[PDB]
């Protein structure tokens, strides 16, 4: 159908890759998978609730932290309900249902519906409690105490403002309609010969029968002058028998030139339908600059790539939270046994949307380690994404990102991404499409302005206007934050931060009227650096605050927003009322500076003593965390602090010193030189407490870290004092503090 094709265009637009392509395919696994995923889709679509799906409540079954239960005074929690230019503070019990809270407020308005400005006729059942300024609803049979946003407010100590407005139309989430000659014969392959357009010793071929990173058999060929089309036409029979080939077995062919590896390509010996591969093959190889070294995909670049030629015999054919995360250990390169992997994914199904959100990235990457495209692991992601709009959001960008910069897996992630899009509803597709236009729009401007490297300062404003005038959406959903709708663009505040790369500082007027403020949305659109890094450091950082939460610890980390939107492109959230330590020292010189700035920003004296307490915790949170991740040694320029005293590192891309605990920091804790302080003591106590809390999960952390590097990790094992007991590790950290306590401004200047 034409329409069916008009919609395909639309999808190929978000995906960024064409799945109907056949140019770089030596079979049909991709096509077969595209149809294999249809069932899981409809199945998930058919069972989801139109109401709750469209509202996508953010809740949690975890109990409430002690540091949070303490927060709520008596058995109540104040909530402010807004409508128009009116708002009221209502008392509510932690165990009160959003709907219950709404029945209350409504009865309290038995004769005042006019004040709030609630249409007398307008039923009460036709109202929903939405967080003001963002697309976060408080709905469903769930205690107000279990909504992430509440916990967020209680925690950060902010007030809870909900705007009484109308529920989304579920109708907006409409979804479109639509055996061998002998299994005892030792396997063997015929290497015809290599070939290559241009060229920079001698070279031979290496053929291995593999099952993951595990090499079974291995054969080579007679060395020959690395001409332009070396030939061999030799048979390489392996010791393995057809029947002995393991499911997912690979034919690894590598070109060696002490010999050096230059090229490599892989071929699935046992196709998805459990059938030995057979025939003539011309595989465009990959070139040396790991999971990429395992991909079964061939090189998209047919024009200028080393092509090896093989021939396989043919035959006759008629016509329980941080615990579950440990399961992710079975989903890396170490385990390739489909069965083993399945059990693992199964075990992951018991996770809640909130937890999947925390491992979504690790999991996505884990897909590269799968022998075939269709797998439980992909189906788990597909389903968990079609089931929840917030997961779906991040699953989109994570996939669209990999597709935008990894040709080794662009094909696979694409088939998966399309599977999702075909069932996330029409509304979702639209929102996705608007976002794509923007990140694809500002992307242009970034290159149009970075190629101009002040009058450029005006070039930015100019170009922004071009977009500003009928071309850029009236408003879009901030990528790193699905709950934030950035509307108008405040070109005035837009600039071009000067650094190695040329990041773009953009401000956007919130598109939400209920927004309890005139502040603007700050997003840094940066090109050049691969935001894949940051995302991983942040992803872990969050898994740490939860590790500490299960121990009543709030180190006050600030995992700002960051999402990779393409290749070496992406955006990073901007934290208002926050500057870098460097800038502060640049606005003066004395070890008291930082402490001064704080008090200078804190209104009341009681406010200052707060930032100090918060500084203490945040600083301990990052010290410990940055040390266990091996990124403590940093520059004042890469460290920021909020006017409320919440320290936090940024820009992740990694004399000697454990971490950053300069004089100015120590000063704020009321210490200097070699002395102590009640606050500095508190700092040490927290450090040690947090540090040990992380060691209680040393395993989870190593499995999470290694998984990354796969797409020496023996350092973190030391940072985590593995082997040593509490009383020993405790001393280990304290000592590290003393190191910073003596380096002063050595490493900083």
């Amino acid at each position: 159908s034409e329409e069916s094709q008009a919609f395909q265009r639309q999808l190929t637009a978000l995906i960024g890759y064409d799945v109907t392509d056949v140019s770089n395919v030596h079979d049909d696994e991709l096509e077969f998978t595209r149809r294999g995923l249809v069932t899981p889709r409809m199945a998930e679509v058919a069972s989801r609730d139109p109401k709750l799906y469209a509202m996508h409540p953010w809740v949690t079954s975890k109990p409430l932290p002690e540091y949070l239960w303490k927060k709520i005074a008596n058995n109540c929690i104040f909530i402010k309900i807004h409508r128009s230019t009116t708002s009221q503070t209502i008392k509510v019990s932690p165990d009160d249902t959003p709907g219950a809270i709404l029945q209350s407020f409504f009865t309290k308005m038995a004769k005042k519906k006019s004040l709030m400005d609630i249409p007398e006729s307008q039923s009460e059942q036709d109202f929903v409690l939405r967080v003001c300024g963002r697309d976060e609803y408080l709905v469903g049979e769930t205690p107000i105490k279990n909504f992430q946003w509440v916990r967020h407010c209680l925690k950060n100590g902010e007030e809870i403002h909900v705007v009484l407005d109308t529920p989304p139309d579920p109708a907006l989430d409409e979804v479109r309609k639509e055996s061998l000659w002998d299994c005892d014969r030792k396997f063997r392959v015929k290497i015809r010969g290599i070939d290559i357009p241009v060229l920079p010793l001698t070279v031979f071929v290496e053929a291995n029968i593999q099952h993951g990173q595990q090499v079974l058999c291995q054969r080579r060929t007679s060395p020959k002058p690395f001409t332009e089309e070396v030939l061999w036409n030799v048979w390489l029979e392996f010791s393995i028998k057809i029947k002995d080939l393991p499911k997912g077995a690979l034919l690894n062919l590598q070109i060696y030139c002490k010999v050096r590896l230059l090229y490599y390509v892989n071929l699935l010996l046992i196709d998805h339908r459990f059938l030995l591969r057979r025939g003539e093959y011309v595989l465009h190889m990959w070139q040396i600059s790991n999971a990429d070294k395992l991909t079964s995909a061939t090189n998209p670049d047919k024009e200028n790539s080393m092509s090896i030629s093989i021939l396989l015999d043919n035959y006759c054919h008629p016509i329980s939270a941080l615990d579950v995360g440990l399961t992710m250990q079975l989903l890396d390169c170490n385990f390739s046994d489909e069965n083993v992997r399945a059990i693992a994914v199964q075990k992951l199904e018991s996770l809640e949307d909130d937890d999947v959100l925390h491992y979504l990235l690790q999991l996505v990457q884990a897909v590269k380690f799968e022998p075939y495209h269709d797998s439980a692991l992909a189906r788990f992601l597909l389903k968990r994404g079609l089931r929840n709009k917030r997961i779906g959001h991040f699953l989109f960008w994570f996939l669209r990102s990999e597709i935008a910069q990894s040709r080794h897996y662009q094909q696979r992630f694409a088939v998966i991404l399309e599977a999702y899009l075909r069932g996330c509803g029409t509304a979702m597709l639209h929102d996705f499409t608007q976002q794509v236009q923007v990140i694809e729009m500002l992307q242009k401007v970034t290159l149009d302005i970075k190629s101009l490297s002040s009058q450029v300062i005006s070039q930015l404003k100019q170009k922004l206007e071009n977009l500003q005038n009928s071309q850029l959406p009236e408003s879009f959903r901030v990528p790193y934050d699905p709950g934030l709708k950035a509307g108008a663009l405040a070109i005035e505040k837009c600039k071009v931060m000067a650094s190695k790369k040329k990041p773009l500082w953009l401000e956007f007027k919130c598109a939400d009227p209920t927004a309890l403020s005139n502040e603007t949305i700050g997003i840094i659109f940066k090109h050049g650096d691969d935001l894949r890094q940051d995302m991983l450091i942040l992803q872990i950082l969050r898994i740490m605050e939860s590790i500490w939460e299960t121990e009543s610890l709030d180190l006050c980390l600030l995992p700002y927003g960051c999402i990779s939107t393409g290749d070496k492109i992406g955006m990073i959230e901007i934290v208002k009322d926050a500057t870098t330590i460097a800038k502060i020292q640049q606005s003066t010189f004395k070890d008291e500076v930082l402490n001064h700035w704080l008090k200078e920003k804190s209104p009341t004296e009681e406010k200052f003593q707060a930032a100090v307490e918060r500084f203490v915790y945040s600083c301990a949170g990052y010290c410990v965390a940055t040390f266990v991740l091996g990124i403590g040694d940093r520059h004042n320029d890469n460290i920021m602090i909020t006017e409320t005293g919440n320290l936090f590192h940024i820009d992740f891309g990694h004399e000697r010193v454990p971490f950053v605990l300069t004089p100015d920091f120590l000063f704020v804790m009321g210490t200097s030189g070699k002395k102590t302080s009640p606050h500095f003591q508190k700092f040490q106590d927290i450090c040690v407490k947090a540090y040990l809390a992380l060691r209680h999960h040393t395993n989870l952390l190593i499995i999470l870290f290694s998984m990354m590097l796969m797409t020496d990790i023996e350092y973190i094992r030391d940072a985590l004092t593995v082997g040593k007991n509490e009383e020993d590790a405790k001393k280990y950290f304290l000592d590290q503090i003393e190191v910073c306590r003596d380096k002063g401004w050595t490493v900083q200047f």
Partner: protein
């Protein structure tokens, strides 16, 4: 479109919500609905200046006195209200006066002493006392009545003007 942040404070029951809802919806509420903290906004044109009023309706019950510092800080102008048939509330007006000076470490904070419920016969707070006190504080004094709309718009606009003269 200047935005004036006005705060209405006073004892419990003196009529801070009546005075407000009166000036907002131009209607007088008879039921007593104890307030914790309600907020209301209204685009008003004072002396042709066309501004925006941010009226904050605070609590009177000392059971929420904590949150006084919060608003007393962000507050641009205070409408110190008391009932003329209830002496206590009058005395309590000093309590608010001090905490505001303190919380704002100033002596010129824009304030307006408001005597309310003037439509009630049984007065117990002579206007001389109220005038003198107001005179002491160096701020205007305006008797009102959310029932008969007496002095209502005047009280609020006088505050907006106090905020302007400060």
């Amino acid at each position: 479109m200047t935005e004036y942040k006005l705060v209405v404070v006073g004892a419990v029951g003196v009529g801070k919500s009546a005075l407000t809802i009166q000036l907002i919806q131009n209607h007088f509420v008879d039921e007593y609905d104890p307030t914790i903290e309600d907020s209301y906004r209204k685009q008003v044109v004072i002396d042709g200046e066309t501004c925006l009023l941010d009226i904050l309706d605070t609590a009177g019950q000392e059971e929420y006195s904590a949150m006084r510092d919060q608003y007393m800080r962000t507050g641009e102008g205070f409408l110190c209200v008391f009932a003329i048939n209830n002496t206590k509330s009058f005395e309590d007006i000093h309590q608010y006066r001090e905490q505001i000076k303190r919380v704002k470490d100033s002596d010129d904070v824009p304030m307006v002493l408001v005597g309310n419920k003037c439509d009630l016969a049984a007065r117990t707070v002579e206007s001389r006392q109220a005038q003198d006190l107001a005179r002491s504080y160096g701020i205007p004094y305006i008797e009102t009545s959310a029932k008969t709309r007496q002095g209502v718009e005047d009280a609020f606009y006088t505050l907006v003007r106090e905020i302007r003269q400060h």
